[PDB]
Amino acid sequence: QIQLVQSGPEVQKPGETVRISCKASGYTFTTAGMQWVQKMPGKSLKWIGWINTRSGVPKYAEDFKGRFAFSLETSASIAYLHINNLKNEDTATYFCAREGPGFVYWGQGTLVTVCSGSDYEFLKSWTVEDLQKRLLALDPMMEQEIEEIRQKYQSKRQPILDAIEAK
Amino acid sequence: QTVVTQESALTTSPGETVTLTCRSSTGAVTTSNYANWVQEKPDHLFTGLIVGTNNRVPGVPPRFSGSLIEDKAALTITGAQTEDEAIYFCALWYSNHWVFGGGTKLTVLGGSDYEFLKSWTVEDLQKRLLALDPMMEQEIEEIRQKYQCKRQPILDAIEAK
């Protein structure tokens, strides 16, 4: 019944700012602290800090205090994570998680993608025709990834449907 | 400076007991490290298992237990189930910050077993079924955004001519 629901994925360019929300339900929002965690792609987890939801006082991990900030909208049961002056290395899935001590309940994660544009270096030497061909080729790649996700979720629904039907 | 180390991978089979460990590079893990164990399944779906060394999170099945063994924190799964195939992360508290281990990829042999769903109510099954839809849409939107980044430098290069 306790749920933490985060805002959707964000895509940004270096130097921009993002705000991620974490909406809590099923407990009194102000009675337990909210933690934030970063999971960079393929890698493990780093604690960003917590915010005390009774007093509003945060605690930050050292590497995150310069550009990462927490806030609250207590009346709405929302905790926010603010990341300013985005860097390529900020690309990661961010989680809120409720105390504690530690990480008892977890939000579903919010993927922030910081576009590096690092291909622009070599792509500027290409003809328009080669660039257009590359652009068009991204479409079947994307649609096949999306269709694979749809098929994966269909295979996740089936055992549940079968269990429902057997009742 | 402190590094937390877990087995990179373990394999078990249904009904076995498996123990995962969590070691501190400073010395012994103690109750003052408030050891956590959390579980990751696809896609980046995390749940809490144990906090404070040995406190089992409400709703976590009793086959999971936390303890300290030989100066390490330990998660014991007594009677592993196929649904326990997942990545398990520990976290330790060091006075003023949490440090995560690198995670243990636990494989469970025996394919997929769905007999556990038979014990659920139809209402809870319907709830689980519907909850898959936001998960799917989130994954799809993440892919769209990945491709937005792939496309942008190409568009920029065309526009710059």
């Binding site: 602290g33 005390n52 939801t53 009774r54 007093s55 105390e99 504690g100 001590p101 | 408030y34």
Partner: peptide
């Protein structure tokens, strides 16, 4: 003990 908000 643990100084977070539990």
């Amino acid at each position: 003990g643990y100084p977070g908000q539990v």
